[PDB]
Ligand binder design. Sequence first.
Ligand SMILES: NCCC[C@H](N)CC(=O)NCCC[C@H](N)CC(=O)NCCC[C@H](N)CC(=O)N[C@@H]1[C@H](O)[C@@H](OC(N)=O)[C@@H](CO)O[C@H]1NC1=N[C@@H]2C(=O)NC[C@@H](O)[C@H]2N1
Lengths: 52, 88, 104, 63, 117
Amino acid sequence: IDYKDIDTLKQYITENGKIVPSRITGTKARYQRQLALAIKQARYLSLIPYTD
Amino acid sequence: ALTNADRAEIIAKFARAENDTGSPEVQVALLTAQINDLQGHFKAHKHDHHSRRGLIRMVNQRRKLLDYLNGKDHERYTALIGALGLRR
Amino acid sequence: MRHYEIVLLVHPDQSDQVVGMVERYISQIKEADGQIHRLEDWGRRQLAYPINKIHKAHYILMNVECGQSTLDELEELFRYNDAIIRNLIIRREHAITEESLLAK
Amino acid sequence: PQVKLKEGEPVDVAIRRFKRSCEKAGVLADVRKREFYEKPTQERKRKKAAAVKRYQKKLARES
Amino acid sequence: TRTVSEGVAHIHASFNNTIVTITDRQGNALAWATSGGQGFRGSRKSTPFAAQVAAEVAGKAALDYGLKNLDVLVKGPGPGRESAVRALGAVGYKINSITDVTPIPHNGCRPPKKRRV
RNA sequence: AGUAUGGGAGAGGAUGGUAGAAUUCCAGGUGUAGCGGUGAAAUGCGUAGAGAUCUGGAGGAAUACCGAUGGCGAAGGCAGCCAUCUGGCCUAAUACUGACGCUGAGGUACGAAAGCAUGGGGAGCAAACAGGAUUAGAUACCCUGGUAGUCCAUGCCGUAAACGAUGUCUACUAGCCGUUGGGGCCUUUGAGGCUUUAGUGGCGCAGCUAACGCGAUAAGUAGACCGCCUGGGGAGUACGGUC
Ligand SMILES: NCCC[C@H](N)CC(=O)NCCC[C@H](N)CC(=O)NCCC[C@H](N)CC(=O)N[C@@H]1[C@H](O)[C@@H](OC(N)=O)[C@@H](CO)O[C@H]1NC1=N[C@@H]2C(=O)NC[C@@H](O)[C@H]2N1
């Protein structure tokens, strides 16, 4: 998963902007790590908010 | 860092037969090249102890291979250390 | 030569001037050597949070291949150009040429 | 949160809904966590105990 | 003297005290009341009843400017964050939204040491 | 035991840059009697305009969520993001060398926190210290402040319940259930199900143990080498020596 796919990125973000754990999403661990990296990159690039 | 071309050139220079990669001459030549290359890195990063451990391991492995080669054949050992410019 | 992906955020006031800068950087990369593998303009987009009291930005994506020195020169240019407010440089394996999701 | 109010909703349902959203978010737990400094030793001990409890709960609900 | 229609109510709720500040939009204060301002000095400043009294006093004070609708922002833990909203609704403003704005560090400064009570 | 070539996972290490949240201080706007703190208070701050709220600056330190009997490292330890330099590990099949191995007295390298030296930095926290409480007393626990230090550069010190209170290497000895990184196979289309390998956990047959317990990650069955113990105090002390 790449940081540009904000449509998939928002699926794993709570309302206030936090990352949703794999405990809830059922995501596999490697995918979860890639997803967290993509979310942080998008936050830096201002495609998605850090909070709210 | 050395590239595949550099390593292949060293292997071709020091090989003792066709497809020979495990001979003491080839192994010691590769180790010497790597050890000499890393000296530039440890000049800039004096406090990279975690990486310096690997260099110490390379030095120890080279010493063991040299001692084995000297035990097996003194002429090949002399020729190899002369070619590589090593004190011992 | 290594492969790099560059994302540039340019001030909306320089939305017209973005074109000159892009050809400038492309020409510099080509003079060094290199190959531009992908170039995309995402246009003007709304920021998720204000940057320097600005709510809009012009987005540029480049996929380039270059040596070390040219990467340093590009980094210096991005640092000292006031039009660019944010940049992201990511080293990549292979080369990417497909149409991005965000460009549309 | 940002619990906007419908015209039909009274203040009491507003408060209950906003309280539920705050429980979902968990801000108050964060505030109580950062009220005082917790040392790394105690933090690791607490997390290890939590892991043991989680595994035992999983085993109990499995059988 | 000044007239505004929309408002905001900031409820600073804390384990020791609750402060209600009714402000216009863009945050210029219009009315404010705390528990100590109505009494309950010392340990009693933190009760929901004191929070409610402070909230009603602030709302009645702001009615002189005259506001119909307000957004409520709550900050902090502690008793009275719900009670104050209850009192404002009882006074009769219409609450547009209620959002929690308690600040959270992303591992910023080091907290004080633990109390050995 | 080692080498060459393809592929893979990682808070492994060093250098530089950068991002957002929060605390503190400063300057303005609106605004007016309290705020703060506790078991309860008082010290303290406030009409010289505090606290609360909005805006704009300065600076330092640390990286919420992800996050996990998860991962990496010889151990000590390692957590935002990006680039540069760099170590080791896993995995497949060929090819290559041909015992090149294991352990290791002396020796040498690394080695948490506190501490020391020279020069910077200093938000928050906080030994010492000052005041307020509690107390028969309080030299403490609690509260209000607060210097060294915590931070950076370059060196020293060499100690911790530095712990798995369990030295390193090798082979063998029922099974069942998880989890991380890979390989292969099978259905059949997207996801599952079998095996194997290197880690990391929970039970448990045999065996072992004074017992507790350990039980393929042994404290079982054996082999190689090293370190250490010989009743409790005196005492890791005195003297001599090295640093
Ligand atoms: N090959 C290389 C691999 C290296 C790696 N290291 C893996 C490894 O090799 N491990 C070896 C296993 C040794 C084992 N650790 C010894 C042990 O477990 N107890 C020591 C003897 C104590 C006594 N005989 C039994 C006991 O009192 N038990 C308690 C008890 O059951 C329960 O406590 C309470 N309150 O009832 C539980 C939860 O609190 O804690 C246990 N106690 C503990 N649990 C902890 C734990 O596992 N570790 C660290 C430490 O914290 C441990 N103490």
